[PDB]
């Protein structure tokens with residue numbers, strides 16, 4: 001990309017969102033799933049480049065990092081601890097609820113004792129007393145919902161979790177969770193090409209809940225679409241940057257976490273916060 005947003009990217013240009021009304025982030029965050037090996041498994045191939053991605057965040061204004069016990073597993077949290085501890089000026093969000101038998105292989109396990117073991121492992125790896133934003137990675141359909149929600153309420157009471165998020169949930173599931181704890185954020189798949197969670201987004205906006213879109217660059221597959229390309233060309237931008245600028249303008253509660261393991265791509269992603277789309281642009285994209 002050649003546009004002026006490339007010159008000094010700054011995630012604070014996306015605005016500040018106060019998670020739960022008290023924990024401030026710049027909305028354009030960083031997804032830390034990709035600083036792992038193929039299959040979200042083990043160390044990344046170029047570990048030193050992954051370390052440089054983390055080191056680059058502060059100067060680009062990125063202060064919101066999303067990871068998970070299951071990213072690696074362990075590897076993503078460990079690299080975050082290596083490079084970002086003691087996290088001055090950072091909010092690290094993490095998750096438990098998925099097990100990892102191998103590359104590309106995921107298993108839901110929401111048993112309360114397993115959720116607690118995952119949370120305790122994250123605390124120890126990240127070297128903190130309390131997780132700022134802890135997310136139920138999935139509601140495990142094999143375990144009664146209320147037992148998982150009750151375990152998480154215990155995490156909050158025990159002071160181990162500050163704010164609670166959900167992931168890939170419906171409005172009905174949010175309202176059920178709300179009987180046990182405030183839902184500070186949800187993290188649902190959402191991007192310009194996949195708006196199945198539109199109703200949940202509107203619910204989050206109506207209730208001041210942060211909406212974290214995962215796969216905000218549709219897993220990097222932003223190519224081949226003439227209208228997106230035309231909006232990008234007009235801004236001296238890439239299609240991926242317009243995809244991010246689109247969701248930033250779509251709703252004031254959206255908190256994109258584009259994932260990358262390369263410094264050049266991190267810079268391009270943060271630079272999307274400096275783009276100003278018109279309402280002509282939004283009309284064309286939708």
Ligand SMILES: NC(=O)c1ccc[n+]([C@@H]2O[C@H](COP(=O)([O-])OP(=O)(O)OC[C@H]3O[C@@H](n4cnc5c(N)ncnc54)[C@H](OP(=O)(O)O)[C@@H]3O)[C@@H](O)[C@H]2O)c1
Pocket residue numbers: 030031032033034066067137167168187213214215216217218219220221240257258259260261262264265266268269
């Ligand atoms: N809660 C859930 O169920 C869930 C599920 C999936 C993801 N997530 C979280 O959401 C975050 C983002 O989602 P995602 O990583 O799966 O997909 P994504 O951010 O939409 O796209 C990531 C892909 O795009 C590439 N990429 C990123 N920036 C690029 C750029 N400027 N130019 C070219 N390629 C670029 C990346 O490869 P390179 O490394 O080569 O740049 C990567 O392969 C994840 O990291 C994770 O934190 C959550």
